[PDB]
């Protein structure tokens, strides 16, 4: 898996924004098959900077209840689960694309 199938997209959220502003942390949606090592390698190849460390989470799928055309519960649908990455850079390092 090339370093392009690893990193999916960043996250722009209030929590991630404050974290990035304060302690220089970047949060990404990554592929579920990645791990710490190739996430770090992918960050290096993509943005030409080596991260101090990486943390990964598995976000479970959010369940929804599906109702008929009239509308009344007939089953349980679900969103897609995904993997979230916190990436820690050195205090001088930055990522510009954001």
């Amino acid at each position: 898996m090339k370093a392009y199938d690893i990193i999916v997209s960043p996250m722009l959220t209030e929590k991630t924004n404050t974290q990035r502003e304060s302690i220089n942390v970047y949060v990404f949606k990554v592929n579920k098959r990645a791990n710490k090592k190739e996430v770090g390698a992918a960050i290096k190849e993509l943005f030409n900077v080596t991260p101090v460390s990486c943390n990964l989470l598995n976000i479970k799928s959010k369940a929804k209840v599906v109702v008929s055309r009239k509308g009344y519960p007939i089953g349980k649908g679900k969103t897609s689960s995904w993997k979230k990455a916190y990436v820690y850079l050195k205090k001088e390092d930055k990522i510009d694309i954001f």
Binding site: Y4, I7, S9, P10, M11, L12, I97, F98
Partner: peptide
């Protein structure tokens, strides 16, 4: 093209 796709995803998330 993989560059293009990655950058496009990033810009889409940026909004």
């Amino acid at each position: 093209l993989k560059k293009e796709y990655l950058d496009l995803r990033f810009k889409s998330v940026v909004g």
